[PDB]
Write a protein that binds this ligand. Structure first.
Ligand SMILES: Nc1nc2c(ncn2[C@@H]2O[C@H](COP(=O)(O)OP(=O)(O)OP(=O)(O)O)[C@@H](O)[C@H]2O)c(=O)[nH]1
Ligand SMILES: O=C([O-])C(=O)[O-]
Ligand SMILES: [Mn+2]
Ligand SMILES: [Mn+2]
Ligand SMILES: [Mn+2]
Length: 620
């Protein structure tokens, strides 16, 4: 026992029992309770009753609003400083810097942010002591991956935000049954605070508790800890998602021989009754959710959704690359979603869905740019800034990175194997990003090694998912730049090593560009459901169809190999144009980037593919 009261927080528990927790779980809750000083401790059970109480609570505190037009949907509006990921405040702590990022040749590293353990100690101690005064500490037991599955990973998140609790119930498998599966086994330790101890020294904007000045999202892979302070936005506060299932998991995957990637998983069935699964890595806000849920325009084709954002993959005993989606919902970008672009999303989000930073209509619905739906007379709009909004201002009505948070089981095309603990077999991997110039609609890699180099070479216009402005063209290898848990050079060698596995059925690798623009500045390709025409070509190439032509950058479809019927007006010359001037500059920029940023940790096979590409272009 103790010598006084001291450390027994039993009297403060308003739901559950510290005694019913596994020993290591109890030490985790109580040690941080003593540090953060919450007024109450709520051990989540994941039940419908509890969700209703949390929602009712948040509605009484002005944190969310009911959207009366839909069935159990809610709107939350944030402080405008707390709207996206902050890559410059996201850090990984290792003893040696080289374990986290390659030591660059000349400049600062863009492949992660390393912080020493001693420096993190000073930052932690300046933030967390007493940070939950007057608040409830919620204890969230959650599973990444199907519950009870051997490949699932379990975490415990402590947080003082009911908004985080509600969203974690949608995005993970959460509650009492997870604790029963965990037993006395290992768990990922997740600690979150909005960083606003009561009484408030500073008044809150839109009732949204956050601390932008002190915001810090830290990862400690050696201790299996994620520590996040000051932000409520989902990417920073839903610690099972980016922090756990990409950053921590990518290091675990390196150590254990699997992969954790920023990829969708879809199944596509053709008119002949054959179905294949594909994975695709596009950077944030570059089309993964719209592809994973696509409504194909080609008759006889069907797409089903396994996951839209995170894939965990491993070769099985038979040599098949098998993937699971570790998430339980979709946390998708709202603006641009409409009946014409993503009708399957529209059907999904009309019930049991939490919206953040979209507009509200006066009849209790939602609005955002590109929704493409007229309102009835008399209906008015309130912007995400909680202001009257007319369609002839300059501010958009919904934040560019506003999101819906919706259960995956509600998607009309959710794949029947999406909770299969054995995973689905991946037969192709797709890379791509926002390239307005030079990069053709689709090409295929020449080999496994060339395909890894294609992922390493990815570049893309910046988006609103993070703090980057200007629409400039940035490097984003494998769509994982903000998400590497460890040295990117070692990550490349891990990928390349997969071709050494016995009986490994390596998937085909493709690169796409939906975003090429003409001299006018409008897209050459209609995209969305029409991307089915590109997937058809990939499907045939996986079956071995002689439908490709060899080019300096890879294989591209032969003339008339793509079904272009019904479009007709598509400029095929510009969509597949390979300019030598463009690609000479492209290889130079890739060379400079890899040489500076990966330096001594660049695998030889990647350097060899760079040299070979440079030679093929020079012979044009
Ligand atoms: N022109 C064009 N735009 C697209 C296409 N697909 C998606 N978009 C737009 O790109 C934006 C981002 O699309 P998403 O599918 O949400 O992006 P994501 O890859 O899932 O992004 P994260 O969830 O942040 O990882 C949306 O507003 C879409 O409307 C396309 O095929 N063509
Ligand atoms: O939130 C996301 O999924 C992102 O930023 O990629
Ligand atoms: Mn993402
Ligand atoms: Mn998405
Ligand atoms: Mn090799």
């Amino acid at each position: 026992p103790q010598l006084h009261n001291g450390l027994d927080f039993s009297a403060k528990v308003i739901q559950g029992s510290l005694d019913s927790l596994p020993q290591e779980v109890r030490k985790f809750v109580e040690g941080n309770a003593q540090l953060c000083q919450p007024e109450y401790i709520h051990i989540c059970d994941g039940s419908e009753e509890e969700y209703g109480r949390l929602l009712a609570h948040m509605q009484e505190e002005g944190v969310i609003r009911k959207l009366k037009k839909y069935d159990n949907c809610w709107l939350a509006l944030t402080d405008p400083r707390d709207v996206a990921r902050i890559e410059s405040k996201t850090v990984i702590i290792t003893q040696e810097q080289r374990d986290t990022v390659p030591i660059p040749k000349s400049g600062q590293s863009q492949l992660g942010r390393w912080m020493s353990e001693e420096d993190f100690e000073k930052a932690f101690n300046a933030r967390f002591p007493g940070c939950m005064k007057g608040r409830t500490m919620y204890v969230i037991p959650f599973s990444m991956g199907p519950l009870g599955s051997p490949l699932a990973k379990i975490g415990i998140e402590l947080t003082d935000s009911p908004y985080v609790v509600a969203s974690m119930r949608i995005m993970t498998r959460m509650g009492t049954s997870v604790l029963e599966a965990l037993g006395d086994g290992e768990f990922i330790k997740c600690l979150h605070s909005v960083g606003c101890p009561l009484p408030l020294k500073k008044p809150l904007v839109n009732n949204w508790a956050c601390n932008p000045e002190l915001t810090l999202i830290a990862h400690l892979p050696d201790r299996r800890e994620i520590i996040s302070f000051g932000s409520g936005y989902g990417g920073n506060s839903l610690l099972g998602k980016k922090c756990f299932a990409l950053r921590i998991a990518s290091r675990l995957a390196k150590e254990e021989g699997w992969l954790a990637e920023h990829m969708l998983i879809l199944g596509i069935t053709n008119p002949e009754g054959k179905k294949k699964y594909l994975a695709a890595a596009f950077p944030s806000a570059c089309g993964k959710t719209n592809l994973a849920m696509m409504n194909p325009t080609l008759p006889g084709w069907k797409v089903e959704c396994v996951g839209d954002d995170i894939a965990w993959m491993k070769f099985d005993a038979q040599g098949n690359l098998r993937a699971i989606n570790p998430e339980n919902g979709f946390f998708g970008v709202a603006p641009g979603t409409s009946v014409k672009t993503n009708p399957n999303a529209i059907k999904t989000i009309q019930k049991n869905t939490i919206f953040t930073n979209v507009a509200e209509t006066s009849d209790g619905g939602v609005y955002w740019e590109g929704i493409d739906e007229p309102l009835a007379p008399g209906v008015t709009i309130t912007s995400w800034k909680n202001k009257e909004w007319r369609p002839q201002d300059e501010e958009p009505c919904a934040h560019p990175n506003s999101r819906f948070c919706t259960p995956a089981s509600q998607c009309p095309i959710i794949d029947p194997a999406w909770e299969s603990p054995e995973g689905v077999p991946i037969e192709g991997i797709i890379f791509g990003g926002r390239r307005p110039a030079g990069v053709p609609l689709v090409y295929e890699a020449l080999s496994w090694q060339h395909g890894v180099f294609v992922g390493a070479a990815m570049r893309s216009e910046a988006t609103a998912a993070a703090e980057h402005k200007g629409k400039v063209i940035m490097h984003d290898p494998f769509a994982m730049r903000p998400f590497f848990g460890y040295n990117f050079g070692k990550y490349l060698a891990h990928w390349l090593s997969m071709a050494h596995r016995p009986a490994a059925k390596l998937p085909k690798i493709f690169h796409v560009n939906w975003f090429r623009k003409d001299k006018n500045g409008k897209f050459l390709w209609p995209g969305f459901g029409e991307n089915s025409r590109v997937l058809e070509w990939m499907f045939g190439r996986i079956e071995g169809e002689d439908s490709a032509k060899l080019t300096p950058i890879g294989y591209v479809p032969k003339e008339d190999a793509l079904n272009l019927k019904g479009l007709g007006d598509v400029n095929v010359e510009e969509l597949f144009g390979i300019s030598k001037e463009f690609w000479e500059k492209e290889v130079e920029e890739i060379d400079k980037y890899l040489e500076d940023q990966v330096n001594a940790d660049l695998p030889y096979e990647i350097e060899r593919e760079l040299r070979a590409l440079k030679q093929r272009i020079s012979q044009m």
